[PDB]
Paper text:
The attachment of myristate to the N-terminal glycine of certain proteins is largely a co-translational modification catalyzed by N-myristoyltransferase (NMT), and involved in protein membrane-localization. Pathogen NMT is a validated therapeutic target in numerous infectious diseases including malaria. PvNMT possesses 80% sequence identity and 93% similarity to PfNMT and is an excellent platform for structural studies, while to date PfNMT has proven intractable for X-ray crystallography.
The current study describes identification and validation of the consequence of a single amino acid substitution (G386E) in the substrate-binding pocket of Plasmodium NMT, identified by drug selection of a non-synonymous point mutation in the nmt open reading frame. In contrast to G386, E386 places a large, charged side chain in direct proximity to the nearby Y211 residue. Interestingly, the nearby His213 displays a larger degree of flexibility in the PvNMT[WT] structure, modeled as two possible rotamers (H213a, H213b), whereas the residue adopts a single conformation in the G386E variant (H213a). These data provide evidence that enzyme function is not compromised in the G386E variant.
Residue numbers in the entry: 27 to 230, 233 to 410
The structure:
């Protein structure tokens, strides 16, 4: 039915546009006309201003998401973003505190809903648009299917429009009207035995053969790959910024955004560079996103690395991503996850990735344009 979404400026399920269409559904919007009142909540609920730089507010967000956020289709793993990860994800350059929106139940003073956005410049089919990047929509499990999600979406839309921003980018595992692209997840086992025992992976292929199949030589193809430092920011900016221009959808990073999104933070973000004759010629990056293991008496956490942005000019992309796997292994990750975006799909078979069973759909709000294969996607959202 899509009874909420069809009231919104998004494509209808049957909409199809060719390359000559690349523009808003609704243009000529006016800040002075935006609703100035918060949207009404059901009785006993209230909007809450989450200060993610406040330890208590940030821990309430963490707890809400730890207990209630995204689970896999088989309900065995739930994402477990850390408090430090949330800080990094939500306080990117020029972030707005008004875009970190909580809902509390007054009687218990408990956070039961959350939605967030950060500002980012998005190039879609070579047009660069100031957008809001919406993430972490969460409604407490006990309150599902009470139509709270539309109210959260409408309220953050209002707050984004008050900054004279009228487009948004978001991803979801569920199908909504209507993806601009759709990218399957793929998974490269690192700690084989653990993945088998938690039912992430399967045997048939004995235990010892599986361990041998996925073994990793502890030698880099690019021997001087090293952790990124502050002096590397301009070089990473130039290397990644030039690389991303080939894609139909990417973020246009400023130097300040490069510093924020790529300077290493232990157990949050890992970036490695290859410096040659002064110049950053290759880079590898992946972020940490563990999953809670629901109902396993031996293991409580899956330590997963997620491919972020990877560029090579002195090796093949397979060689580069082989080093990415090694580096994730060296930092104690159990599995290395990646989407079939950018050049990634070309190395999945040779590097012994397995196809997952879920995909990530890319969405734009108030924008109509042609869809495209995920190899043309040049952005990875958290
Ligand atoms: C300009 C500016 C624009 C700014 C706004 C742009 C639009 C942003 C849309 C949201 C983007 C989300 C990005 C993500 O962060 S991804 C992660 C999704 N997080 C989870 O998976 C956590 C686990 N899960 C939950 O916490 C809840 O299930 C949710 C996701 C809150 C859903 O709430 P529940 O209580 O089920 O559903 P209710 O409150 O009755 O609302 C029904 C309507 O809602 C739609 N919907 C459902 N899931 C959605 C979802 N994930 N994103 C958007 N919409 C969603 C759904 O179709 C339906 O509407 P219809 O009637 O079908 O038109
Ligand atoms: Cl080495």
């Amino acid at each position: 039915d899509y009874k909420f979404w069809y009231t919104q400026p998004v494509p209808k399920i049957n909409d199809e546009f060719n390359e000559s269409v690349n523009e808003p559904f609704i243009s000529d919007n006016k800040v002075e006309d935006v609703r100035k009142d918060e949207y009404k909540l059901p009785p006993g609920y209230s909007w809450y201003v989450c200060d993610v730089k406040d330890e208590k507010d940030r821990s309430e967000i963490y707890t809400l998401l730890t207990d209630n956020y995204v689970e896999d289709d088989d309900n065995i793993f739930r994402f477990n973003y850390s408090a430090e990860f949330l800080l990094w994800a939500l306080t990117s350059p020029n972030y707005l505190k008004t875009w970190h929106i909580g809902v509390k139940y007054d009687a218990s003073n408990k956070l039961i809903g959350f939605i967030s956005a950060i500002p980012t410049d998005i190039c879609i089919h070579k047009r660069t648009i100031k957008m809001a990047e919406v993430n972490f929509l969460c409604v407490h499990k006990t309150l599902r299917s009470k139509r709270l999600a539309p109210v959260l979406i409408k309220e953050i839309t209002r707050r984004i429009n008050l900054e004279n921003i009228w487009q948004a980018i978001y991803t979801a595992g569920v199908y909504l009207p209507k993806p601009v692209s759709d990218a399957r997840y793929y998974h490269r086992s690192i700690n084989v035995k653990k993945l088998i025992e938690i039912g992430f992976s399967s045997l048939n292929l004995t235990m010892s053969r599986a361990i041998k199949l996925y073994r990793v030589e502890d030698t880099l193809n690019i021997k001087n790959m090293r952790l990124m430092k502050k002096k590397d920011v301009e070089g990473v900016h130039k290397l990644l910024g030039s690389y991303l221009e080939q894609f139909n959808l990417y973020a246009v990073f400023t130097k300040e955004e490069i510093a924020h999104w790529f300077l290493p933070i232990e157990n949050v973000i890992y970036t490695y560079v290859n410096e040659e004759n002064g110049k950053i010629k290759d880079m590898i990056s992946f972020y940490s996103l563990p999953s809670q293991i629901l109902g396993n008496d031996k293991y409580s956490t899956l330590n997963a690395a997620y491919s972020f942005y990877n560029v090579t000019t002195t090796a093949t992309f397979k060689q580069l991503m082989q080093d990415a796997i090694l580096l994730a292994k060296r930092n104690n990750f159990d599995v290395f996850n990646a989407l079939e975006v950018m050049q990634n799909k070309s190395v999945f078979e040779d590097l012994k990735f397995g196809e997952g069973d879920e995909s990530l759909k890319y969405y734009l709000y108030n924008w109509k344009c042609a869809s495209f294969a995920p190899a043309h996607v040049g952005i990875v959202l958290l």
